[PDB]
From a paper:
Closer inspection of the 50S•Api137 cryo-EM map revealed a highly defined density for Api137 in the PET. An atomic model of Api137 taken from PDB-5O2R11 was easily fitted to this density with slight adjustments, confirming that it represents the Api137 peptide. The N-terminal and central regions were located within the PET and extended to the constriction site formed by the ribosomal proteins uL4 and uL22, while the C-terminal region was located towards the PTC. The negatively charged carboxylate close to the PTC could repel Api137 from further protrusion. Due to its stable positioning, the C-terminal carboxyl group of Api137 is able to interact with the RFs and arrest them during termination. Careful inspection of the 50S•Api137 and 50S•Api88 cryo-EM maps revealed an additional density corresponding to another apidaecin molecule in an unexpected location near the exit of the PET. The density was defined in the 50S•Api137 complex and allowed modeling of the peptide chain from Asn2 to Leu18. The N-terminal region was located at the exit pore close to the ribosomal proteins uL29 and uL23, reasoning the observed cross-links of Api88. The binding of Api137 was mediated by multiple hydrogen bonds and stacking interactions. The C-terminal carboxylate forms a hydrogen bond with the ribose oxygen of A1319.
Proline-rich antimicrobial peptides (PrAMPs) inhibit bacterial protein biosynthesis by binding to the polypeptide exit tunnel (PET) near the peptidyl transferase center. Api137 and Api88 differ only in their C-termini, i.e., a free acid versus an amide, which are negatively charged or neutral, respectively, at physiological conditions. To further interrogate the molecular mechanism of Api88, we incubated purified 50S subunits with Api137 or Api88 and subjected the samples to cryo-EM analysis. In addition, high-resolution cryo-EM reconstructions of purified 50S subunits incubated with Api137 or Api88 confirmed multiple binding sites for both peptides.
Author numbering:
A (entry chain 2): 1 to 46
B (entry chain C): 1 to 271
C (entry chain z): 2 to 18
RNA sequence: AGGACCGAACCGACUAAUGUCGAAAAAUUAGCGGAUGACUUGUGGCUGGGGGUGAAAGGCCAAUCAAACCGGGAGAUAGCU
RNA sequence: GCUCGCCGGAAGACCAAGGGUUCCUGUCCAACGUUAAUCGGGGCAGGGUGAGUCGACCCCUAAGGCGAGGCCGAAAGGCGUAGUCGAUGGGAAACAGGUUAAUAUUCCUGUACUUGGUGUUACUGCGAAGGGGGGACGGAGAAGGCUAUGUUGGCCGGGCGACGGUUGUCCCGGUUUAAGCGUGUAGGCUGGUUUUCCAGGCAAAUCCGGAAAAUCAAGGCUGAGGCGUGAUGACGAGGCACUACGGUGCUGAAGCAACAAAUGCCCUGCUUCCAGGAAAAGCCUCUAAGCAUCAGGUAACAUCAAAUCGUACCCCAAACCGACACAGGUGGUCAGGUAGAGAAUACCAAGGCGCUUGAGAGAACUCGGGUGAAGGAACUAGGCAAAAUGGUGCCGUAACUUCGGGAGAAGGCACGCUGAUAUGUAGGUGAGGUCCCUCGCGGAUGGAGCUGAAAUCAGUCGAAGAUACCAGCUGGCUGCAACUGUUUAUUAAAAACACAGCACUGUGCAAACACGAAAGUGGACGUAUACGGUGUGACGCCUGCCCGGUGCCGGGAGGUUAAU
RNA sequence: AAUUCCUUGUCGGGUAAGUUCCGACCUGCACGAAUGGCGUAAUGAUGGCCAGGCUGUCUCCACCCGAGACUCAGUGAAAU
C-alpha cells in the first residue's frame, strides 16, 4: 500500500514554498489571508 | 531491397523489412547533428493538440540543406545515410571547397556521383536548377514555392512533380496528389525523384513497431462514451449517426479548404 | 474527545426487489 | 534474430480459503500470469474542474468523481419529514 | 553464562529519500509499552556529529520554469527573444592501520594526490561571449584476457582427547596488506611524416576541412591485470602479566603455490540489428580587436590558500509513508560454504534475532495440516478444492498447418553406492628443464603438479536410488477473439479495448485539425510513399442489389429570400 | 447460432438414463456479406462437453498434529 503522501522536501518547497507563493498574485493573496488570520506558520518551510 | 522474414513466431510473421545495403553503417556526421526533443503532441499550453502521438525511440535531427545556395560549386557524394526524421534517405555531399552538407537522395544518386547547383549546371539527376531552365515535361523534387524559401513540395520518398506548362513568369506543377499548382519561375527545384521508392512495401509487422515509431494507439469513436465523443453509447454497437470528428465537424466527404488567399495559384483540385 | 471523523460507507443492503 | 520458450528478482492480481466491530478503510496463505519488452522503476518537470487524462471502464485526477477540493453568494430553496 | 530454535540475495551489512536527537552515559518507573518491569525508541540531566580529497555549495547544461525590451489581451494577465534558473546528467584530488561509552576515507600514524594565488630563475609572442577538436553517448549477442572471491596443498602455531580407534594421508586455527609512483602487458583504434595550394568553418587564422605531390612502411593513441616500490612498516593466531573482574598492557611465528571463477574490470571495446540511439562547460588547439623595453604564457623551485554547510542514529523499519511499537508500501550498493544450471530451494558461516502477555487443561466447534479400509466424481450449478503429474539422458512422437509449428505432443527405457577400464580417463590448466631470441610481462619443446566430466563392465544395499526440498496433469470435439499486450486502484481481466493490415475521407503547407477572446504554439523544424479524422480488425475466399429518406459533393433555368 | 418466443425443434453420436455438448436437416418468430460474411494453424489464468489418471469432493466420515475455543493470573474493548 503506497499511500497518497510521499514526502519530498524539494517538491514541497517548490509547490507551496514562500517563493512559489509570491511568484504569482493569487499566492500573494494567500499569504495576505494567512497574515490577517495571524497564523504562526505563514507557509511551509524548514 | 525487400526481404520477407520467415514466420518464426507471431509478431515476426508479417514483418516485411526494407534492407538497403548501400546505407552507411556508422555514426552520422556530428557537426551537422542537432538535438530534437519529442513533444508528445503537447503545445506551449501543455494540452494535447494532436492525438495519437507520443513515445518512440530517441532520434537526432539532421540539418538537411534544402535551399542549396552553393551555386557553381561542384560537389561529390561521400555516402548515403539513414535519417530517422525523413521517410527518404539523405546523402552526405562534400563540396570542392571542402564543406560537407546533407541533401535529399534521389533515385539515381549513389556514392561517388557528381552534383552541382545553379543555372550553370547540367541536367543530371540531383542537380538544382530553376524551373525556367529546366525543360518542360521533366520530373523534379524538393520544389520551392517562393524564391529562397528552401523547398517544400515533393520531399517524401519516391515523390516527384511534373512541369506541365510554362506560362511566361509562372510554371504549372502537377503533384503526386493530382494537384495542378502555379508556381513562380525563379524559385529553385531539384531534378529527379526522391529515392527509397519502396517505402510502401514495409508493413511494420506487429503492434509495437508503430509504438516505438512515435505512434500511439487509436481509440474508435464507437468504443467511446456519449459524453467524450459524438459517437458512442447504446447497447450492442449502435451507431445511427453520421460520421463526425470528435469535435463535431462532419468528416467523410466534407471539404475543409477555406483559404481564399492561395486559390489564385490553384488550377485544378484533386480527382 | 474528538467525535468520530471518518464514518465508513454502510454495508450494501440485501436486495429486497 | 525473436512484442520467442521454461523460470527467480521485479511487475501484475485469475482461483480458493482465511479475514469483515479484521494484523490491513482489499490484506495474508497455497497455487496462478508477464518476465528483452506495447517491459518495469528512481528523480524532476508539464496537462486544473463544464477541464485534464484515458490501449475507453464514465475509468482516474491526494482513501471522495455522470463533473474534484476549499472559501464565498448562503440562514440558497424545500407545497416534504 | 550454558543449551535449544529462526533468518542467512536477509529477518545480515552499508547509502539516498524522509524523519530530526530516536545516538551514548548516569538516573527515575507515575503516564507511554496492549501484561509485569529493575528494562526501553518512555521521563530528567550531561555528553556526542572534527574533511583541500566524501556529499552539498560551486562551473555547465536536459525536460521545464521565470523572463529586460517585445508581441498580444476589458483589467488581472498570456506568450516569448537576449538572458537567467533548473540534477535525476557532465566537470580537479586519499588510501591502509589504530583509537572513543557514542564521530572518522573527517581525529592519530604512515605514505600520496589535485586546483589556484604570490615570489624567484630560464625561455617565449600573448590575446576572446569567435572557429575547430574533444567531451559525446542505442539495443542485443559472443569470445578472449583478468580480478574480487572460493577450494585444496604447503608452511607456522596448538592439540591427541572424559564412550571403541586416532603421532597420522590425523584434528583445529592462521596463512592479511591499500591509494600513489615505476614498468608498462593481453586486447582495441588509426597507415605516418614533409612541402604547396584552396571563394568552406557568417571576419580572420600557423587550427579543422579539402585538393596536390615527395618519402617510409612505421609510428601514435587507448589499455584491465601482472610484476616492482609503497612495506626489514602495519596487521597477525597464540602466549604472558594485572582486572574497579567489563577489559587493559606486553609480546608476536608462518604470511606461499596450485586450481576454480564471476552478473565485476579491459569494454564510452568488438561483432551485428533497425527503431538510428542528449546538451553545454571544464579540457586541447587556431586567430580577431588590442598589447609586443610591457603585460601575458611555458618549465622548474619556494611559499601560501582550499572557505562555507551536511557528518549522530533509523533507513525493507518499533525511528520513513499507513491515526498504532500496524502480518502492508519504500530506490541503490555488498552478497560467502555444501548440494544445484541458478540471486530457485534445503542446510549453514559472518552477523542478527526468538516477533512485549503468560501458565494449565487436551470437550464440542472453527482455523492451518497429516493419514486412511472398499468404492473412485456416485459430490456439485461446475472435478470448486484437494490428490496426482513434476528432473536428466536416450528411444519415440498423431490429426492439422500460414511449413515456423503443433511438441516437452502422446507413449516407453535407464538413474544409488563401490571397483575396474584409468594405482581418476577424455578435457582444461601448466612449473622446472631444454632450444631460440626484432632480448622480454617473449617464442618453441616438454610434460611434473593441480583440476575434472560422461560412458561401459562387474559387484553390492534397500519395499522404494530424479529417494528430501525443488519440480508440467494429459488427450478428444467445439464457441469467441488472430496472436504478445491493455482495462472497471477497492466485487466484472472478458467475447470488451488495442493491434499489424485494409478501406473511405480531409489536407498543397501561413496545410487540414487542435489548444488559445488574441498573439503564439502543437501538427512539424514534417510536407501527399506525409499528416488528421472515421470505420473495420492478422491471414485465406470474398465483400451482392437499392440514391427514395437523412447527410455529403457538383450544377444551375425559374421561384422564395436579411441587412441596405 | 453468443441470435430460435413457440422448444427439451427433428434424426443420429456419446451415457443404463443427455433441457448441455458434437454432426446433419432448415417451419432463419427476429443471420447475412467493412456497425463485415464464411473459414482459419498458432495463442488464451477465455465459454461448453467428453475420456484417462488421480484422489476424503462424495457414499460416511474416523483418527492424529498444531493455533483458538475452555480454566487460572494481568491488562481490558465494541456495536446496542
Amino acid at each position: 500500500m503506497k499511500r497518497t503522501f510521499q514526502p519530498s522536501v524539494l517538491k514541497r518547497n517548490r509547490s507551496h514554498g514562500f517563493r512559489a507563493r509570491m511568484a504569482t498574485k493569487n499566492g500573494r493573496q494567500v499569504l495576505a489571508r494567512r497574515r490577517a488570520k495571524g497564523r504562526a506558520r505563514l507557509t511551509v518551510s524548514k | 531491397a525487400v526481404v520477407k522474414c520467415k514466420p518464426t513466431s507471431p509478431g515476426r510473421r508479417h514483418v516485411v523489412k526494407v534492407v538497403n545495403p548501400e546505407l552507411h553503417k556508422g555514426k552520422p556526421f556530428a557537426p551537422l547533428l542537432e538535438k530534437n526533443s519529442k513533444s508528445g503532441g503537447r503545445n506551449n499550453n501543455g494540452r494535447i493538440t494532436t492525438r495519437h502521438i507520443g513515445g518512440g525511440h530517441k532520434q537526432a535531427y539532421r540539418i538537411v540543406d534544402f535551399k542549396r545556395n552553393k551555386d557553381g560549386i561542384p560537389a561529390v557524394v561521400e555516402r548515403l545515410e539513414y535519417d530517422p526524421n525523413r521517410s527518404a534517405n539523405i546523402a552526405l555531399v562534400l563540396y570542392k571547397d571542402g564543406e560537407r552538407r546533407y541533401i535529399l537522395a534521389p533515385k539515381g544518386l549513389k556514392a561517388g556521383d557528381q552534383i552541382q547547383s545553379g543555372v550553370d549546371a547540367a541536367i543530371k539527376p540531383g542537380n538544382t536548377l530553376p524551373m525556367r531552365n529546366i525543360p518542360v515535361g521533366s520530373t523534379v523534387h524538393n520544389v520551392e514555392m517562393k524564391p529562397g524559401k528552401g523547398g517544400q513540395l515533393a520531399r517524401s520518398a519516391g515523390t516527384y512533380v511534373q512541369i506541365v506548362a510554362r506560362d511566361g513568369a509562372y510554371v504549372t506543377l502537377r503533384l503526386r496528389s493530382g494537384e495542378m499548382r502555379k508556381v513562380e519561375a525563379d524559385c529553385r527545384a531539384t531534378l529527379g525523384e526522391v529515392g527509397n521508392a519502396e517505402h510502401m512495401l514495409r508493413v511494420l509487422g506487429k503492434a509495437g513497431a508503430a509504438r516505438w515509431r512515435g505512434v500511439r494507439p487509436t481509440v474508435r469513436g464507437t468504443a467511446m462514451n456519449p459524453v467524450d465523443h459524438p459517437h458512442g453509447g447504446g447497447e450492442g454497437r449502435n451507431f445511427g449517426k453520421h460520421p463526425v470528428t470528435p469535435w463535431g465537424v462532419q468528416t467523410k466527404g466534407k471539404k475543409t479548404r477555406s483559404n481564399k488567399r492561395t486559390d489564385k495559384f490553384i488550377v485544378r483540385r484533386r480527382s | 474527545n474528538n467525535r468520530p471523523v471518518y464514518i465508513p460507507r454502510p454495508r450494501p443492503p440485501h436486495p429486497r426487489l
